């Protein structure tokens, strides 16, 4: 398993190496089923490829793995395309980082000349509205707080009025955290979506999320139609395999990376960098 260009990749080389790759992906928290598909994808791509002069069979397979991973994660950075009017939803599991991400997005775009409006739609978590209200003050962006029991139609009414009177062109709706299997709440999210009509629905996923990332992404996507993702808490040391799991089942772009607890802690997501991270290059 350590010789220079003296043969094409054999099925015997793609059994010893990919077994280690499968383990690395699992340790990185990439979902099991996603890992088998990825390994079998590499097996097909590498199957019987030439191992030039220089390069060992291992190196060629490792290169194939990294390239496949980079591609599966998005290839190159990609940010949302904004139009005259934009209304986005931040959705996801309890504690993923939605409220903070909404404030980060507001600051990021305000700096780009947009005029954002933050909408605190979480009325179940104690002090949730105060939380976004405070962040709004910190980033210098208006915050509309939904009232207890307010209907989707009423929310739409007030959001429309405020956006018009204050010339807002990017409305960020921060929703409460909910389990992807909570029928009542997932139904409420779907109804809010049909009434408000978001141009983007972003699933905020914690980088430390484990094997269930797959089911979580699929449920939110099938119930409310995810258009993109935000991977938070990347300033931690979690490998971030949940990102590949979410990408694999939704096919949607991972727009941003959350890299700190501060409002400025937002940046474009780079497939290349997470690929290395998942493989343990950092």
């Amino acid at each position: 398993g350590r010789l220079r260009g003296r043969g094409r990749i054999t099925e015997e080389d793609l059994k010893a190496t990919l077994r280690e790759i499968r383990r690395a992906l699992m340790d990185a928290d990439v979902n099991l089923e996603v890992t088998r598909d990825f390994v079998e994808r590499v097996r097909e791509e590498a199957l019987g490829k030439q191992v030039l002069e220089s390069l060992t069979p291992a190196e060629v397979i490792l290169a194939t793995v990294y390239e496949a991973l980079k591609e599966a994660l998005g290839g190159e950075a990609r940010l949302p395309v904004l139009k005259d009017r934009n209304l986005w939803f931040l959705v996801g599991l309890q504690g993923s980082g939605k409220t903070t991400t909404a404030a980060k997005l507001a600051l990021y775009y305000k700096g780009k000349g947009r005029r954002p409006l933050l909408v605190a739609a979480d009325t179940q978590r104690p002090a949730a509205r105060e939380q976004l209200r405070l962040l709004g003050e910190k980033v210098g962006v208006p915050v509309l707080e939904v009232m207890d029991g307010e209907s989707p139609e009423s929310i739409r009414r007030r959001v429309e009025e405020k956006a018009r009177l204050e010339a807002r062109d990017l409305i960020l709706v921060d929703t409460a955290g909910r389990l992807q299997i909570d029928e009542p709440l997932m139904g409420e999210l779907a109804r809010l979506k049909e009434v408000l009509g978001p141009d983007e629905v972003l699933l905020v996923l914690d980088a430390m999320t484990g094997q269930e990332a797959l089911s979580v992404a699929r449920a939110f996507d099938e119930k409310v139609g995810v258009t993109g993702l935000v991977l938070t808490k990347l300033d931690g040391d979690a490998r971030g395999g949940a990102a590949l799991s979410a990408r694999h089942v939704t096919g949607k772009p991972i727009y941003f990376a959350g890299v700190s607890e501060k409002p400025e802690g937002l940046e474009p997501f780079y497939p290349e960098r997470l690929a290395g991270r998942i493989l343990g290059m950092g």
Partner: protein, 277 residues
């Protein structure tokens, strides 16, 4: 036959976030037991990797069956709650207040999160709902000084328990971890024998990074217990296996909702049954 069952079991454990290391160690042992009905031997084994206090486990092995459960009780009067951002620290404290107030205890809370927006007001609101006093300060107040004041108030008023909330922090930030140690030192300054309990909060949906979190917080403040939240979801909380096996920290409670009563004492049997579906 058995090889298909072991293969099935491996997938089930991995899907539950148990990890490769622990999963292989479990299957290797079960395969060596010669037991015909795996799964059951596995359940028996797991109901062992979910309890370091030892004795109750040994009793079932000697053909005995002594039980009692008995409401979980803090060793002392102060409980320091720690964990990374978003896991459920604040809400778990509210639930612990409800749990112990139902047992007749006089409970007080310390809104130690003076860092995050509404971090303290959130706990204050829970205290109001539960008629539990909450010591809090303006955002930016020194958490250690607040904790010290909280312990002093608890002693002066004759309260039985004080739960100290802390701001969320990633285990990879040495400065924030030092702050946590400062909070523990402030508590001991107000009462030399405290805190008797330091409980880590873990989100059931967390993958293998959960082991690193547990290791780092344990190294920083010496954990005496762990609470796993959000088990009402689809995640099984399997990372607890490697954690309890490597750190020997007991699981105290499980969080199963966002209501004041959505807390249950940890039950090894039920947990393992759910983990294996």
């Amino acid at each position: 036959n058995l090889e298909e069952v072991l293969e099935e079991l491996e997938m089930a454990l991995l899907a539950a976030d148990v990890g490769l290391s622990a999963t292989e160690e479990i299957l290797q042992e079960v395969r060596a037991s010669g037991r015909k009905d795996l799964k059951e031997a596995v359940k028996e084994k797991l109901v062992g990797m979910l309890e370091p206090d030892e004795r109750r486990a040994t009793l079932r092995k000697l053909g005995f069956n002594p039980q009692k459960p008995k409401p979980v009780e803090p060793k002392g009067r102060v409980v320091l709650v720690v964990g990374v951002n978003g896991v459920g620290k604040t809400t778990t404290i509210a639930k612990l207040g409800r749990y112990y107030q139902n047992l007749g205890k006089k409970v007080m809370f310390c809104a130690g999160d003076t860092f995050r927006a509404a971090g303290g007001t959130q706990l204050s609101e829970w205290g109001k709902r539960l008629s539990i006093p909450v010591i809090q300060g303006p955002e930016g107040t020194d958490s250690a000084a607040l904790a010290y004041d909280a312990v002093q108030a608890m002693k002066a008023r004759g309260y039985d328990l004080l739960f100290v909330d802390t701001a969320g922090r990633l285990h990879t930030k040495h400065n924030l971890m030092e702050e946590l140690k400062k909070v523990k030192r402030a508590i001991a300054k107000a009462d030399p024998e405290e805190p008797k309990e330091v409980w880590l909060v873990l989100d059931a949906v967390t993958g293998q990074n959960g082991l690193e979190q547990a290791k780092k917080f344990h190294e920083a403040v010496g954990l005496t217990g762990v609470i796993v939240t959000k088990l009402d979801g689809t995640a099984k909380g399997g990372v607890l296996i490697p954690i309890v096996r490597t750190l020997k920290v007991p699981i105290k409670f499980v969080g199963v909702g966002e209501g004041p009563d959505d807390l249950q004492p940890f039950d090894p049997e039920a947990f393992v049954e759910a983990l294996l579906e």
